[PDB]
Amino acid sequence: GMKPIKEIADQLELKDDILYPYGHYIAKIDHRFLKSLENHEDGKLILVTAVTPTPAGEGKTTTSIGLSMSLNRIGKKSIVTLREPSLGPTLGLKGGATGGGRSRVLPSDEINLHFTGDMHAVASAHNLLAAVLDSHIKHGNELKIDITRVFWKRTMDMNDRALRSIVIGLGGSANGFPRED
Amino acid sequence: GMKPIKEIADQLELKDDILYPYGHYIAKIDHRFLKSLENHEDGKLILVTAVTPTPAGEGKTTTSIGLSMSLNRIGKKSIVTLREPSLGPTLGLKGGATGGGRSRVLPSDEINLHFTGDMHAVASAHNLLAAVLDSHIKHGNELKIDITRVFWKRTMDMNDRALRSIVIGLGGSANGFPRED
Numbered sequence: 001g002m003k004p005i006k007e008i009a010d011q012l013e014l015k016d017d018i019l020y021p022y023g024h025y026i027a028k029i030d031h032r033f034l035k036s037l038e039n040h041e042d043g044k045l046i047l048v049t050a051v052t053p054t055p056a057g058e059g060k061t062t063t064s065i066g067l068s069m070s071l072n073r074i075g076k077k078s079i080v081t082l083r084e085p086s087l088g089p090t091l092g093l094k095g096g097a098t099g100g101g102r103s104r105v106l107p108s109d110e111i112n113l114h115f116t117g118d119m120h121a122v123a124s125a126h127n128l129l130a131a132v133l134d135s136h137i138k139h140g141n142e143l144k145i146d147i148t149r150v151f152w153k154r155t156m157d158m159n160d161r162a163l164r165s166i167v168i169g170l171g172g173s174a175n176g177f178p179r180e181d
Numbered sequence: 182g183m184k185p186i187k188e189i190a191d192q193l194e195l196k197d198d199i200l201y202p203y204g205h206y207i208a209k210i211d212h213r214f215l216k217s218l219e220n221h222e223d224g225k226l227i228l229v230t231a232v233t234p235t236p237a238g239e240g241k242t243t244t245s246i247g248l249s250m251s252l253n254r255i256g257k258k259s260i261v262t263l264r265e266p267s268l269g270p271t272l273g274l275k276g277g278a279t280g281g282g283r284s285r286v287l288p289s290d291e292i293n294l295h296f297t298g299d300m301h302a303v304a305s306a307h308n309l310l311a312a313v314l315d316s317h318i319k320h321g322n323e324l325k326i327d328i329t330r331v332f333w334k335r336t337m338d339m340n341d342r343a344l345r346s347i348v349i350g351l352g353g354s355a356n357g358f359p360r361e362d
Contacts, residue, residue: 148354167348170361173329178359180351 002106012079022116025107043077061096066103080105085112087119088159119157126155130181134169138176147179154181183287193260203297206288224258242277247284261286268294269340300338307336311362315350319357328360335362 005027009019018030048064061082068080082105085097090112098108105111114120130152137145156163169178186208190200199211229245242263249261263286266278271293279289286292295301311333318326337344350359 146354147358167351167359170348173327177328178348178361180353180359 023110026110026116028116057096059096059100061098062100062103065099065105069103084115084118087113087157092159123155123157130154134176134179147177150179150181204291207291207297209297238277240277240281243280243282243284246280246286250284265296265299266293268300268338273340304336304338311335315357315360328358331360331362 002025005019005021005025009027014029014033018033020028020030022028046067048060048067050058050060064082065080068078071078083097085095089095090097098105098111133145133150133152136143137147154163166181167178168181169176183206186202186206187200190208195210195214199214201209201211203209227248229241229248231239231241245263246261249259252259264278266276270276279286279292314326314331314333317324318328335344347362348359349362350357
């Protein structure tokens, strides 16, 4: 029962030329737009936080969303900014990163899952460095990298305890050099 | 019903100066004694071999010992020479490496187990090299050893399949460099 992204974008007076849709209900906004707006006036910033978290669940995200909705409601133009949830945890347990009840961000499945691919993009960049590091070592290690002193790890957006402590680079010369990761 | 080793040694005209006892029933002979005998005549050499081995077991070692015993019996002075068995396989299965029935080499338990410690000596020397190789790499690898191209393995006299393929040198900088062994 919800609105085409164009209708949300119109609320903020955003033009197609800086909007990249992802389906009918999501868009990226070109970040360079922000520099365009540099002579424009800042609104107010409200920081939402909480008491010491307990297992009983305090519903901070639901409240952040609720607050923005309520401000709009009382005639004060408001946007809620949230972090994108990691996929991994959701595959383990339902969480609250997209709010709850009548106070959510939508479409919630997409937001909780692949969304617009940002998590994947980060992982790719991250893992590229790891792949290049190992391949540098394999091909002569001109940088004289100490394979017992590598700070950089690999990454996935998955709750996988099996990957906490591993040994890589096995199988022989063609596969490069063994090391811990 | 065993003869003290000095008795056996006497049969062969071996003097104490070249005899190193291990208990009352075993001795080492100084290898340098062989060179002493270089002007003495060689006897006959009988090679004992066998048809293609089968799971039924052909008793070659038992036969070797029996032949030597039988040569002595018919008045022809004879010595049987044998390999020392590995300890490992005996901890797995009784074998025929010290003969069988009425045709054995004695004391059988000792021969089968630690004997005079020659297996332990070999293992020590072998493992020392391995240790020194890894430590060379740890301490700067001046020889530029390629840890994916190490031919040298470690050793033990034990039937332990768990050690066929291992990864060593884990745990961090203080322990050296990870490799397969």
